[PDB]
Amino acid sequence: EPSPYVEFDRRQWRALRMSTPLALTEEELVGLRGLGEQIDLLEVEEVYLPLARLIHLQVAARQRLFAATAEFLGEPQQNPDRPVPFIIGVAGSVAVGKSTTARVLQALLARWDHHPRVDLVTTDGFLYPNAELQRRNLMHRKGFPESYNRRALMRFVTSVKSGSDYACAPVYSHLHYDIIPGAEQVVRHPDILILEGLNVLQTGPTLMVSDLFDFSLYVDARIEDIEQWYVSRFLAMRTTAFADPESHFHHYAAFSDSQAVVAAREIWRTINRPNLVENILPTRPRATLVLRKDADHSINRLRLRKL
Amino acid sequence: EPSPYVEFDRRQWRALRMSTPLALTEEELVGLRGLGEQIDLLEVEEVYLPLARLIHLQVAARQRLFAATAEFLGEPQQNPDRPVPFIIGVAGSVAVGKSTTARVLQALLARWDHHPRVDLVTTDGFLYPNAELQRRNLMHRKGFPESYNRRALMRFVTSVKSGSDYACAPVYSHLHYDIIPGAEQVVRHPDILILEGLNVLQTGPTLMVSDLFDFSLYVDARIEDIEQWYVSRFLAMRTTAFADPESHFHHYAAFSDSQAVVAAREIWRTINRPNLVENILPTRPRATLVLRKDADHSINRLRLRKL
Ligand SMILES: Nc1nc2c(ncn2[C@@H]2O[C@H](COP(=O)(O)OP(=O)(O)O)[C@@H](O)[C@H]2O)c(=O)[nH]1
Ligand SMILES: Nc1nc2c(ncn2[C@@H]2O[C@H](COP(=O)(O)OP(=O)(O)O)[C@@H](O)[C@H]2O)c(=O)[nH]1
Ligand SMILES: [Cl-]
Ligand SMILES: [Cl-]
Ligand SMILES: [Cl-]
Ligand SMILES: [Cl-]
Ligand SMILES: [Cl-]
Ligand SMILES: [Cl-]
C-alpha cells in the first residue's frame, strides 16, 4: 500500500538541512513573529531551512517546465532577468500562525544568492468590503470562501504569474475591520510570490489560485489546540490591539478573563471552526508540505507530497 | 487582462508539428478508430503530432522535478530503466471520442525512440459491479462520480506512479454491461500511463487521480453535437453490438429508427447529459489541452494551459 506522501519527524527532517546558511539574527526573527507565536532560531534551523532548500531545488526544476512549453510554442525564450514567477501558497486555520510561517519563509528566500524579489500577499485584501458583505448577508462569514472576491484574486495572481510588470491588490485593516479606502499593494514581477490565506488551496468548477501554485504549505495543528491559541490570543489582545480606541473591537478591551473566554469561544464556535472543518481542512490533502505543530506551537512533524 | 490559457486554431497548431515523424499507417489508424469517429491521417498529422511533441518535451521536464525532490531527500536517484511514470488523463462526455484520442495517443507515444511502455486504462474497470450499484440505488447513474470505486482507482494510479512493479485494475464489459468476474488488467511499471474516463479530472476533499496527472486532455464539443453523436451511434449499434444476442441491450436491435431516437434521447436526457453538465464540464478548466471538435468530429480549435 504505497502513498503520495512521506511523513517526517523533526529529527529526520532537520538532517535535510545540509549546508544551508542561516541568514537571520534573533532581532530579525523577532520582527517576523506574530502574537503568541513561539518560533526561535532553532526552529528556523531545523524546520525552515530544509524547507528553503527543497523550495530552491524546485524553483530551478519548475523553470525547466515553462521552458519546455515555450520551446514547444517556438517562443522567444525566457530572458533571465524575468523568469516565470514561482508561486507559493500558505494555508491553514485562523490563529495557526500562517502569518509567521510566511514572513519567515519570505525572509529566508530573499536572502538567497541573487537576492530574489520575494513578495508576500495575504488574501485579506480580497475580502469584500463590509458594506458589500452586509449586502450579501455575510458579515458573520468573513473568512468563508464566499466572503472573498475570488475573481479579483485569480486576476491578481494570474496577472503576476503571466509576467505582468505590475499588479495591484486591495489592502485590509484588521484594526478598522475593513478594506482600506484607496489603499493598494503593488507587486512588480517578483521572482517569488507567497500568497497566504485561509482558503488559498481551495479547488472548484473554475480555475483558481491553487491551480497556479508551484508549491504550497498547510500549517496544521489539533483543532483543540488551535481554539486554545485563538481564545488565548483574544485575551492577550485586550491590552494590545483592542486597547486602541479605533479598534473595531475596542469594547472587548474591558471584558474580564472569563467574559472574554466566553466571547472568544462563541466566535470560534460560530465562525472560525465551521470554516476550518467545512472549508480549510478539506484542502489539507493537496498541500505540498504539511507542518504539524504541537500544543506549544512547535513544528514537530511534517508530511511531504512526493507525488 | 491576461490568461492562463492560449487558444489555437488548426492552422496555428499544425505549424507546431516541426520535424515530428508520422509512424502510423492508414490500416493501423483504422484499428484505433471507434464507431462514428472520423479521424484520418491528416488529423493525426496536424493535431496529434504537435500534441505528441509537447508531451515529449514535458516527460523530460517533468522528470527534473521528481529528481529535485529525490535530491532534496538525499535519495539514491532514479535508475533510468525505471523513471517516474508520466500520467496522462483523458476526459470528456460519453460519445465524444475519448476512446479514440487515447488509443491514437498511446500509439503515437509507443512509437518514440526508446519504444516506451505506454499503458492505457479506462476507468470503466472501476465502476462498481451492477449488484453493488443496485444496492446503492445507482443503476441509473452509471458514469456519475459516485458510481465509481474512487478509492480503488486512486490506489491503482498511486501504486503505479509510486514505482510499483505491477498493479491490477478490474475489467468492465460494455456488452455484458458489468464488471467481468475474475478479469484483471495488469500494468507493469509503464513509462506512460494514460487514464481515460468521464470524471478523471474531478477534484475534491481528498487527493484524487487528477492530482497525479502530469498532463491532461479534455475532448470537447458542443453539447447538441455530442447528443447527436450519441443518438446516432445508438442507431448504428442496432446492427453492431445490440445485434449480439448476449448484448445487455439486445432488445434495442429491433427498434425502429424513431423508436430508437426516442430511447436514445431519453437516456441522454436522464443520465449522460446531466452528468456532463453537473460533473464533467466543470472539470474542463483544469485540462492541460482542450481539443474542440466541430459537428463533424473534426478537431478545429485547441486551448492550451500555459499556466
Ligand atoms: N488588530 C487585530 N489584529 C488581528 C486580529 N486577529 C488577528 N489579527 C492579526 O492578524 C494576523 C493574522 O492572524 P490570523 O488571521 O489568525 O492568521 P494566522 O497568521 O494563521 O494566525 C495575526 O498576526 C494578528 O496579528 C484582531 O482581531 N485584531
Ligand atoms: N457494446 C457496447 N459498446 C458501447 C456502448 N456504448 C459505448 N460503447 C463502446 O464504448 C467505447 C467508449 O464509448 P464512450 O463511453 O461513449 O466513450 P468515448 O470514447 O468518449 O465515445 C466506444 O468506443 C463504444 O465502442 C454500448 O452501449 N454497447
Ligand atoms: Cl478562496
Ligand atoms: Cl482564502
Ligand atoms: Cl478553550
Ligand atoms: Cl471519479
Ligand atoms: Cl471517471
Ligand atoms: Cl437528436
Swiss-Prot record, chains A, B:
GO cellular component: cytoplasm; plasma membrane
Key word Cytoplasm present: yes
Pfam families per the UniProt record, alphabetical: PRK
Gene name of this polypeptide: coaA
Species lineage: Bacteria, Bacillati, Actinomycetota, Actinomycetes, Mycobacteriales
InterPro entries registered for this protein in UniProt: P-loop_NTPase, PanK, PRK/URK
Keywords: ATP-binding, Coenzyme A biosynthesis, Cytoplasm, Kinase, Nucleotide-binding, Transferase
Additional remarks: Was identified as a high-confidence drug target.
Any one of the GO BP annotations: coenzyme A biosynthetic process
Cell compartments where the protein resides: Cytoplasm
Name of the protein: Pantothenate kinase
Pathway(s) annotated for this protein in UniProt: Cofactor biosynthesis; coenzyme A biosynthesis; CoA from (R)-pantothenate: step 1/5
Enzyme class: transferase
